[PDB]
């Protein structure tokens, strides 16, 4: 009953096979020769389920040495994220206080969700790349055909939808922008 | 200068970020934050310095998903 | 269409969800947690009593909810 | 004149190279001079192309490997949503399972309260939990005692965060404060 | 918050699907895994029923190839 | 406590790292030589507990198209690539007999997954072409059967 | 020739590169989604043949020594770990039930795989200890069998 | 020129031997599976057939704990 | 002891051999390889008449010989 | 007959076996109903069985491809072993011009089989290992316990043989030799 | 003095510094330099010696890396015999079951006739085979035709060792020599 | 110099060697073949160089295997 | 007035990280770890106190790789 | 037209032919320039944070005394280092106490350049010069 | 006794105490020397071979014209350069064929230095100072 | 007088290949493995023009990487 907990391992049903053979067998009044003969088996089979079960508790405590390493990764992982966090907690607070004004505005643009694709170039007429999660976000920066980033301007040289489907400047209103998948890639030159 | 060595220690904190953030493991653009960190730190011109500076910054920013700035700043 | 002992035929399908769930966390990449995993599954899917799949599936859930964080059982 | 190019070495032997042309065209010099400078200027501004052609490569791949970044964590965001949704239905299910030891865990886990190995089925077998919280800690622990998964468990120890024992007539309301949460409380199953 | 309740049974019956597929070892071929994880991942996040059970033609299709008429058919009971 | 319903026949202190210890011992003399193998019998009733599973969910879903290559399949007309859903796409089937294949072709139309697909190509067991026309009651004993059907599905 | 066999039935140039072709898709469209497990009932069958063709050779080598671990193994008696050969080298191995504990056991001295080992321990199936003197006929039902035993190898 | 005949079955024996416990994927366990090519090995490069015999004991002692009773019993037929 | 079907007991425990010394040259090297080396044997084990387990030892032996040097089939 | 080539195959047995029901359906006179129903498990059989003749047909173009990509691999080391070749012959034609009498001796000494097992040193008393294949080689260079080699002479610190077993330098004559294990491994110290 | 040890850095400092010592101590200066010169002299010798330690150090590990390699090649010798004795096993194996068709592969592989893929059972199947000599390809191959095997070939084309088709007509004692051997034959089984 | 250019030389064709041998298989001993070969490079003694080659060229000849001399010698 | 030297520490730890990577450092995975555990707990560090005492141990790592020569020549402006 | 998608294909095929074959590898070390500039930044840095430990370490190290391990911080925490001359031993210990980085450390061990045991009673001004200088000294963190 | 077995365990540990943390990274590259001695050593071996091909394609690099890839030797085999400046033009190109490397080459196109194609006919003494140098040239390997 | 220019060829082209790996070459696989592959010609050559050719591939490499500023150093003696 309680060694039914390992009901699941193959020798188990030999085992509880071997056992009603037996009690049956004595239960009918059988001979000595049979008898032994499947008390023997019995013993065999019992043997055998013992060291299933061994190796069923062995898998076990591997699969819970397993789930510990698991924690202290976990808590290693957090320790690591502290650190990351102090770092960049430490490298803002260094920008802000270079307070130069090309840095602060990618940051403020950032900030707000405006964020570069590719590195931004300082090549004349050099490709550029940043999305645009909403409208007021890239209000606050296209101004016509010009896009104005990184104390510096560009010309946009196209625009891509959340899709990857091309978009004109022209629906991109106050209220059109609902219309539109969000965000929008904007790909420009410099000037 | 001072302005310059200012400039120059916010970038070695700055590609340390990027390797905090696994960038390494990016070879292609490892080599380039590496060469621009590399460059900073060998410019003489304040100018040179913050161009470079603006390069190497967009890459930490363009991943958005560890740089949540506004949750920084505040 | 037809019943075939309802409680323990959910009992069953939620187990392959779970051990789905935790396939999808990357359980896998830990071999002797993943094959724990796999035969506590194997054994829900072959319990002959609906106590016994759910003792089982007691011990399969607790791997799901020991991976604090990754799971989040609040937002849901 | 070309501005960011001069941390090329190239770049400076081209600038050299070509000041000298215009000085000695200035100076007036002969013709056998200013011919041996120019040769020297045309190697310099061809060894600065083939340069200025191996950087714009070396930025390519850079733009190109955040390109496919950008591509790896969109396929994330997906995974995160598939993920999500198999949870929706995995723990939809679970409910109406309706069990209650299922139910004791996953609402154990909602408050924190989470197993650090597989929880056993046998008696005095081993069990260990996190409960972040003193308010959780009463919830669950009473005396000696510990509920959970509808099973009666025996504390046999208690650690802080710092892998260090803790007595339990420590873990009360009022010394709280004084541990080093969270704790994790090991077990054995009763009954 | 999956769906309607026929959503819900599709997007259950592409996991045990799934979980089939796996089971009969064809993780083995990378670039029909690959498909079959597609066709599951947008069953999923299928918001209409009718894209869900066009994906499931073709993620079951994959399991009926493998088992074959014997199979399935001592199955069908 | 519960801690003496394991750990109590006869008492003291280290007289239970002692118990512990053979315990611990006993499991690894038993487990250093152990079956390695898989029980090929079990692992042969989870996939049929996985199918049935399954079967009965499709069964319940009742749904047209999956009903339709399902039952195509209890007679060997099964899919070699993946259905396809777009237009013009390129789907190969087998038929393993004439009752099957005038009961899913017609002319040059073959009606498979609640869809309509063009036969662009048939090959029979040797790999050789066979014109629809060769495709009929009478002539049938004479094809070599089984048939790969190619067709690109209607708009 | 033989080139003809295969590449026979009406002929010509290219309408040799048309049919090699065919069949090279077809085997593509055959084998693109093809059942990738092992026939388990297979499997089964060798196993069983090189177990077979693995006894009768150790039959034929009628060597003592490896007959009686054989017939050991056969009345449940086998070895926990690899049985050494140099002296006072550890040996466990379990022992199901009294009649082969005593067809084997005589005191303190262990026969097995022509040779002598000094029992330095026994435990039961709870991993206790069992005094030698407790394992006789007459108290063996009341032992937790089956039990482990270790010896040392004897000079 | 491996020996006498009882050598040459010797030695012949400890390669289907070996080939049985691969067989029964024993290859997992590393540590294992080395002790095994080990013994196979030495018997292979054995001159004396006493050696070679002591070492087939230990090689067919990993053979009869993986096996069992009832799986050898019932393949002595 | 006893015969039992000499000859193709024979070819049977060479095959045997056959693929050993193949995986001692490293064969299992090359898994396409390996498997069909490994098809090979098997149907030779599994082989009812004495003719077809010849045609498989012609295969499989043809894969040891063809590997040029690593066995210098003169010296023996 | 021929069809028997893929007797080996799973799918085979079950082809067979439906021929033979359907075959004998039809001997016994059987009816519409079961021959009609035995034709059709025939048919499927069939389509199995054609699949899987496909597969194995791949498995062993598969195979093939193997064999021919090691022949090239063969082929390759070959080439590899030519250019090695090359190379040893042009390296010791020029060591030989060198003419130096420390490098020829360890080269002549390598070439009646005394080579180093660590790196010849240039300490004062450093450690060095040789391996002497025979008792031929052993007398030209070993006179005593002084040891000759690189144009230099080392001290005898120790003799082992081939089964690690130490040695004396007493058992070491032309008659004993044959007694011992060779090749011997002589340590000694630079003087 | 301190010789093999001048390729450090650090030595050269050491040995400035003890000249400039010695040099001081000559010329009688005062004990002002002369404390500051030992001084000098007593950092350069304490990193000399840290320098000699560290290489010391990689020497060492060179040595354990070659004794490595030595004991590798001992396992490789032993791998060897036990190959070499698995070989001699399948091949007195092979002798007696006294098949023609294995004998005869056998034996052409003996002379350098070996198969670059599984021999094929059935017919018109692709065979290839490598002939490494005008006499070996006298005694298997007669006009269009293959022996091997037990078996009828059908020669479908051959090639030398460059890759280049070689007619049938090419072939012979006389023009020999003027073809690239070895020759790979390709063959279709016949009958 | 002449004999000195000769020996250089020579360490570049047997430190080849060594890796066409594939020693660089094993980094410990790869650096210190490479070591001894830069010092033979960078000497400006003539016994400095031969000293360092008796070193570098008694690697190659451990490697039995892969030396047999009296063969090349023929 | 405490213009806050804990926040030069923690920033001049990690500079110092980067001259030990610089040097080479990581060529030694164990010594690398300890490096890197001793950087963390400088930019996670409580009490200024404790910041110091680690900033104390990862920069014995680096002067005992300098060496007393060129350690000297950088504290010549 | 795509009198685009041919002038863009060109720029592409001609940078990819003068970058095929480039050295891109280093020259002339600026990395050494790099490695200088890191350094400078950071002993500036050091000498702005003024602390005791910190420039009792540094200046030990310019004498030639430098540790051997990390700097331990735990009591009983083991330390060596190596004291290059009599000078520098004299100016760091005192009887069977050593004073590093602002710390006591309880002296151990000492051993020769010849890898020998020193009694700290031979140390002394009439009997260093007999010494086998340099000294590796171990000795445990005191409180 | 096993006094050896003492001392062999001293030397052992201090060793390892000196090399523990110690700097086994290049400085004040000799690296750089070693590339120098082996260049010295390479182009001295190509003098000392006197061959007009090498000969050509060496002093052919010294005046800025290098090849963008490898040589190639068969016939019709594509060849690409790069050509600083009229004076080499006028030098190495005579109508359709280039002379490199003691070959002939059949001159298939020629770019821009802004990667655009140039005629053969507009590369003369009285417009070259109109053209965007260098250029890239593309020729085929004659015979 | 034929003093074997072969030998000086082939000893160069050695010479030539560590030049390369010294100038990290192999940084490059495709690269590089053609030039091993020119290396190895050259070595196996049986005809000086041969020999000579390949080298002129493979020096190609080399004058490319230098370029014309380093490549004239190098010239002065």
Redesign the interface.
Known sequence: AIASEFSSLPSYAAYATAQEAYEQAVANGDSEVVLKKLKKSLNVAKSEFDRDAAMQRKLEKMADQAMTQMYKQARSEDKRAKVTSAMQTMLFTMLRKLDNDALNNIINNARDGCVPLNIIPLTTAAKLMVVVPDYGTYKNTCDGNTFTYASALWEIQQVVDADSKIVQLSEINMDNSPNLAWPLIVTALRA | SSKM??????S??????LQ??RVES?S??W??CV?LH??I??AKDTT?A??????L???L???????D??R??E
Chains 1, 10 share one sequence.
Not at chain 2, 5 to 10: I, P
Not at chain 2, 61 to 67: E, H, I, K, P, T
Request: proline share 0%; aromatic share 2%.
């Open positions: 060595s200012d400039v120059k220690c916010t070695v904190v700055l590609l340390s970020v905090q953030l990016s292609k653009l080599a380039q060469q590399n460059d730190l060998l040179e913050f161009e470079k500076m603006v390069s910054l967009s890459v920013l363009s991943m958005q998903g560890a740089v700035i506004n920084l700043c």
